[PDB]
């Protein structure tokens, strides 16, 4: 039935890697 | 301390204090969370 | 069937056809010609049909000549949408959306029906903009334009909140109010997608009379059966209701209510706020959050039936005064006794007039004793009413520190009233135990 | 206690009364100054319990339990705004007035004429 | 840029997270811009949807014991991290739990829904009894411990491994306190 | 004809009572 | 003092169901209709 | 750790190269490619109370050290 939720799956994102503000 | 029962892990305790969690990504698939 | 049911969920979501028994299919799904004529026409047909219908239109309105250049052009004869990219199907999903705000009104009409048949034999957008178009036929619910629009819908491309037509896909007749409502009542989203597309369309001034008494009534009585839904017994679920009610609500109303230039929509608003304020027992602080938006939100054009409201949510509060404002603005009010009057024929204003006038005489200006005045000669309070709002007068007389001049004539006017209320202020006066005779000659030396 | 709405009621259970009757309960009467409920049953027993839901180690505890001899109890009733006196009655040609300070109960037995209209 | 009376004065806004999907306001769930926020007296955290003045759109009640200076059990929530790029929000309270919840996608849902959950004793540990033996197999004698606890709740620990370890349920006890009112504001949710 | 309580049950919940008024 | 409105659904369900929603009376009749409807006057 | 450090470790913070302790009203910051002790961040005030560093600290991501 429509409304019902899917599996659950990490989604890829690309964050900013905090090791360059140095 | 003792001389017969020496201390493993206490168990049944995942986050009992004030002390936040941490959590880091581990690539496109994990996360990696840290309690105290 | 893992495997089936990936392959579903993507022949679900495919778009176009690739087979030709498929497209055929998908050419033949019509609004005017039936299928066995609408399968065998080419794309200078359907556009020399559907463009003498478009001029007829274009003659009609004068603001389709942009969708003149864009929609109903000789190239867009050729146009085809599957093969463009994300940004030109998401900007000719943006000209289509303004087109169907924009055709509204009209859409009873054979010109405008033929215009529609062009943008959906065309561009499908029974198929890729299913949400704005069965959004913009829902009002014409019960006219066979709509039962033919059902009937060439596909059936996994209507989104979630319209999923109650489904028996009126099987079945071809024109569904009715009461299925809306109740599916209205039952889930926030089909609530929130008919409010959305109306202020949509309201922002861009393109409303009509029919869509505004269709959201009108339709989230009057869907605010009706939620709060009969809400109602609990229970205090914490019955807080929790209110307050889900309210999040649910609050950016419609809250955009409705001081949509100035819309009076219609500020109208049907105010309907919405008043079966609010009656029948959902909510907190005084909430309604004065109401009556400060239509305060603020008025026109000459939506007055009276601003002021009815009013008196509704004023009557309905716990406390007596009103909240500074709101008094401002009904000072701002040209004929309010009057008016009051005529509205106290059939509507009880007594505790919206009681607390206009103890938050006149929580100002220390001097400019709202007319209107005090006449509001308590006015016969609209109760006794009780009229004599602590004496009271309160003789104590703010007592607490300044000229202004006792205007004071102590408007209170030699009052104590010389006539009929019950000058009977009520010497019985009040009595029971203060102050003399008249002392701020009397006191003023008159 | 709040001021009540039309529609809904917050009403809600309480612990009941712990000591059952053996018979119907033929009258309930709430005492006009304390939270005093008098019971009455047509086995001839009277209950007094005071309202604490909160009691230990039985909660809405009993004062006293009185027996009226031979008479079932139809109504029993409290007399006036203070409360002061408790009468009780049943099929019998007599009715009780039983008062709670000094603890006196007279049997009213006459009408002054009228005892044989009422049987 | 904005300016939100997003606390009481005795209930001060102590831990804030914003979700960096892309999507999840506006009333239809296509628009950015959301923040969960918790305070550390309470134990429900706040969804506010930042785009028209910064309005609240859910609040999601209850997400672990409120905490009471006068109870036994422990409570409040100490902290919220929504995931990098993730619907996911981790929240972690003194109730000596960590859950997860998720946001919806297809209907929109603005309070999200648990996905995963551990937990253990909100109280002191009352009594403990060791399983007896399956009766040679590989549950052994030393396996399944089963721990009855002050906060009135049986688990049956592993020594094992601490992820089947799990709560021997008495029946709906959330799903009576959510159509109690106890999870909004009696008695309380161990009771 | 039947009571509901005969005179014996009355005086035996009549024993098990704390005050009897006679 | 005052209470809360009752009103039974069907009633509100007719004020609005007598049309359709084009050539249904002006917003401003409906309203005082829904109005007096919900009025507190005895 | 330093020598005089008498105060609680609040919070832990790793950004750059460099790693940073909010202890209660200090700041002790580590260099974390060597892992060594680099200088110590003394906020000041004029009441006793306002020096006491509640909250914490948090870098922004593009704003350097």
Not at chain 1, 1 to 14: I, L, N
Not at chain 3, 237 to 252: A, Y
Not at chain 5, 41 to 69: C, E, Q, Y
Not at chain 5, 104 to 133: K, N, T, Y
Request: charged share 20%; net charge positive.
């Amino acid at each position: 039935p429509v409304g019902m939720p899917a599996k659950w799956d990490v989604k890829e994102a690309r964050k900013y890697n905090i090791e360059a503000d140095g | 301390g003792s001389a017969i029962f020496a201390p493993y892990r206490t168990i049944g305790l995942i986050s009992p204090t004030g002390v936040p969690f941490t959590s880091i990504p581990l690539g496109k698939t994990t996360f990696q969370i840290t309690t105290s | 069937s893992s495997l089936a049911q990936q392959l579903a969920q993507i022949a679900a979501n495919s778009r176009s056809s690739f087979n030709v028994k498929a497209l055929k299919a998908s050419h033949s799904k019509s609004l005017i010609w039936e299928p066995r004529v609408a399968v065998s026409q080419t794309f200078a047909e359907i556009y020399s049909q559907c463009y003498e219908g478009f001029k007829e239109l274009c003659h009609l309105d004068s603001r389709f000549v942009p969708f003149d250049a864009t929609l109903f052009s000789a190239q867009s004869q050729e146009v085809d949408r599957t093969q463009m990219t994300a940004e030109e199907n998401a900007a000719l999903d943006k000209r289509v959306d303004s087109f169907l705000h924009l055709v509204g009104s009209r859409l009873r009409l054979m010109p405008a029906i033929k215009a529609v048949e062009w943008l959906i034999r065309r561009f499908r957008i029974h198929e890729f903009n299913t949400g704005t178009l069965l959004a913009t036929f829902l009002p014409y619910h019960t006219i066979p334009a709509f039962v033919t629009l059902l009937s060439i819908l596909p059936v996994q491309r209507i989104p979630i909140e319209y999923r109650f037509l489904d028996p009126y896909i099987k079945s071809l007749t024109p569904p009715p109010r009461a299925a809306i409502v109740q599916q209205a009542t039952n889930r926030p989203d089909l609530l929130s997608a008919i409010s959305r597309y109306t202020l949509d369309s309201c922002r861009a001034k393109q409303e009509y009379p029919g869509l505004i008494s269709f959201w009108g009534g339709i989230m009057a009585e869907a605010v009706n059966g939620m709060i009969d839904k809400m109602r609990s017994g229970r205090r914490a679920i019955q807080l929790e209701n209110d307050h889900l009610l309210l999040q649910q609500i609050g950016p419609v109303l809250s955009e409705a209510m001081v949509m100035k230039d819309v009076p219609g929509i500020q109208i049907a608003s105010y309907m919405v706020v008043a079966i609010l304020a009656a029948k959902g027992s909510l907190n005084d602080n909430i309604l004065t959050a109401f009556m400060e938006q239509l305060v603020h939100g008025w026109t000459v054009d939506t007055l009276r039936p601003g002021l009815v409201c009013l008196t509704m949510l004023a009557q309905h509060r716990s406390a007596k005064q009103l909240s500074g404002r709101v008094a401002k603005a009904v000072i701002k009010v040209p004929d309010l006794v009057s008016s009051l009057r005529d509205i106290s024929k059939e509507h009880q204003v007594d505790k919206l007039a009681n607390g206009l006038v103890l938050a006149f005489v929580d100002r220390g200006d001097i400019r709202t004793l007319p209107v005090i005045n006449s509001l308590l000669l006015s016969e609209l309070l109760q006794e009780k009413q009229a004599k602590v709002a004496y009271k309160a007068l003789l104590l703010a007389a007592h607490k300044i520190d000229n202004i006792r001049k205007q004071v102590g004539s408007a209170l030699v006017r009052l104590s010389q009233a006539e009929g019950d209320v000058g009977d009520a202020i010497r019985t009040a006066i009595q029971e203060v135990d102050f003399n008249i005779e002392e701020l009397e000659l006191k003023l008159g030396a | 206690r709040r001021k009540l709405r039309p529609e809904t009621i917050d009403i809600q259970r309480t612990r009941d009364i712990p000591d059952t009757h053996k018979a119907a309960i033929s009258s309930l009467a709430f005492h006009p100054r304390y939270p005093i409920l008098l019971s009455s049953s047509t086995s001839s027993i009277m209950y007094l319990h005071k309202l604490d839901a909160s009691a230990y180690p039985t909660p809405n505890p009993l004062l006293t339990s009185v027996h009226v001899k031979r008479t079932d109890l139809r109504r029993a009733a409290f007399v006036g705004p203070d409360g002061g006196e408790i009468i009780f009655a049943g099929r019998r040609r007599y009715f009780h007035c039983w008062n709670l300070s000094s603890g006196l109960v007279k049997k009213v037995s006459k009408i002054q004429g009228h005892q044989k209209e009422q049987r | 840029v904005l300016l939100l009376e997003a606390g009481t004065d005795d209930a001060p806004v102590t831990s804030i997270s914003f979700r960096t999907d892309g999507l999840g306001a506006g009333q239809d769930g296509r628009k950015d811009g959301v923040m969960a926020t918790a305070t550390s007296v309470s134990g429900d955290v706040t969804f506010w949807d930042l785009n028209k003045g910064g309005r609240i759109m859910g609040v999601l009640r209850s997400a672990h014991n409120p905490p009471s200076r006068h109870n036994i059990v422990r409570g409040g929530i100490s902290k919220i991290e929504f995931l990098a790029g993730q619907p996911v929000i981790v929240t972690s309270g003194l109730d000596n739990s960590l859950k997860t919840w998720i946001f919806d996608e297809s209907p929109f849902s603005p309070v999200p829904r648990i996905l995963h959950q551990r937990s253990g004793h909100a109280a002191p540990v009352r009594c403990l009894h060791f399983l007896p033996s399956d009766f040679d197999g590989a549950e052994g004698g030393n396996k399944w411990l089963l721990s009855g606890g002050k906060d009135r709740s049986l688990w049956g620990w592993s020594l094992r491994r601490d992820g089947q370890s799990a709560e021997l349920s008495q029946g709906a006890i959330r799903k009576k306190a959510r159509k109690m009112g106890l999870l909004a504001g009696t008695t309380t949710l161990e009771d | 004809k039947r009571a509901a309580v005969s005179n014996k049950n009355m005086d035996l919940l009549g024993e098990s009572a704390d005050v009897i008024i006679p | 003092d005052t209470h809360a409105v009752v009103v039974a659904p069907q009633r509100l369900a007719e004020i609005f169901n007598a049309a359709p929603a084009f050539a249904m009376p002006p917003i401003e009749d409906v309203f005082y209709q829904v109005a007096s409807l919900f009025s507190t006057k005895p | 750790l330093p020598s005089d450090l008498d105060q609680p470790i609040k919070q832990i913070l790793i950004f750059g190269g460099w790693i940073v302790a909010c202890a209660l009203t200090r700041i002790e910051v580590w260099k974390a490619a060597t892992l060594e002790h680099y200088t110590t961040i003394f906020p000041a005030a004029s009441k006793k109370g306002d020096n006491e560093l509640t909250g914490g600290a948090i870098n922004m991501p593009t704003f350097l050290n």
